Design a protein around this ligand. Sequence first.
Ligand SMILES: [Ca+2]
Ligand SMILES: [Ca+2]
Lengths: 79, 52, 439
Amino acid sequence: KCEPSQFQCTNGRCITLLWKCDGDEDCVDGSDEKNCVKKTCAESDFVCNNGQCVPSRWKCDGDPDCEDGSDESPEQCHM
Amino acid sequence: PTVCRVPLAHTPTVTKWFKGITLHLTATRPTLLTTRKLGLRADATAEWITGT
Amino acid sequence: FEHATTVPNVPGIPYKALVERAGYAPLNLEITVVSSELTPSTNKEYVTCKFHTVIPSPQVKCCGSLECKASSKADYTCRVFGGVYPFMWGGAQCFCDSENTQLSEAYVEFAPDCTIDHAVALKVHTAALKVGLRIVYGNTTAHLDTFVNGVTPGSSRDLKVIAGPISAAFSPFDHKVVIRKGLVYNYDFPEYGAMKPGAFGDIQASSLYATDIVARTDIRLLKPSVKNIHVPYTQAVSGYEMWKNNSGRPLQETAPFGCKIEVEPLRASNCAYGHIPISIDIPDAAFVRSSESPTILEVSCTVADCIYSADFGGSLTLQYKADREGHCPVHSHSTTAVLKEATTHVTATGSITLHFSTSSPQANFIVSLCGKKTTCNAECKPPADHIIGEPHKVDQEFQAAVSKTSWNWLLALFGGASSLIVVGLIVLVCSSMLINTRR
Ligand SMILES: [Ca+2]
Ligand SMILES: [Ca+2]
């Protein structure tokens, strides 16, 4: 264990709270990001109809990237 | 409650002589030097040190 | 068996002893004080912080009189002022010219940020010592936390150690202690109910959310002068703020005996004072017959080089002749010299180099190699380094702290003086009866 000044990975090694819910994966299994409510997308980040945060460059790149395929739907980017 | 990043001062150089030490301290900003003896009497000191 | 040992209470230097009973091989005892906890019995007096002066909306009676009604709120000041004629944005609020009266109220509260910035005034009674130990006997290592009171049979599994009462009762805390954001101060705070304006504890309460807040902050209510509606007041400065300005330094920095003051609970950890009369109860399975242990037929100790220092600044080689292989304990039967190791490999004939530490300027300690005591004589020079980063392993006696050369010369001078005294005595007694027989 470790002090409340540190957040425990689900591995055994604990990183500080400033590194938790900061948009950066610094847990081996990512248990420091996929628990907090910071679901915001960046200024340049495209948003799927499914809510996933995908880079804007990935949109209509020719290959499906997002779970629902909205990134490559003909409606979302005309072809 | 949260966590703040605070400065770490320059590690002092210790000059050793008979029953005493000399601390050559470098501090660009006011820094706290606290000492105390580990016996029956503390003789604790406190000083805010600026400069070398 | 019971081994009456007196382990010095300093956290980190092992205490090496040797336990024997007739017919059994000696065993090596190593007691290490890993952690210490001095937890005193506390009693929460009250909680104080910066007060928030609450001035309610003024009450005005246009043509009439208002009365002061007693209230339970902290430092409730209440005054009635005649002839006011107050003004708001819109002009006169009353129709009488000089029969108006204003009711000025001002009580005190707890600032919203006091859930973090507040002080707890505690009275601490006598302290208790709880130590974590590292008894290593033979080959097994045990960990246990015991109370140093002399009566509790605190036992991990079977070692059944009893920590006898500490020789010198010590406590970094006086009777009254203030705890603020993890800092502990030794402050003679005012009692619950006797609060002075401008001093620490002018506002008091059992808890931050209690309804029994009491305060004496000297709220003086003044006659309104401006035409606009106003409650004028003057108040003493916050005693909490003044104390925060001139608190002094915490016990975390002014404590004696190198104690670490910590909160939740209030405790002083890793203190180095006094002695612990600890009694051990070794399981009989650890001990072994002398017949099976190796025996030493002849051993002689020769010491190469030694400086008396806080570290292990001594070396020692001894030649033995043992009839059987095995392991054997090594121990120094003196308080001024302590060996680094406790056991060593014994093989037929050979020599072993054991490092030790001494404080006397003469290594005149007696070493044991599974029995068969031997004496070492040396010439211990002062150390080269002035300041070291590790505590002294042995105490400073008086007989050992003076060298044998200095002993020889001091004894020579004193014995010479006594020699003149005794020759004077013998000559006067030899002359007395000679004079008596002369006549
Ligand atoms: Ca992170
Ligand atoms: Ca795509």
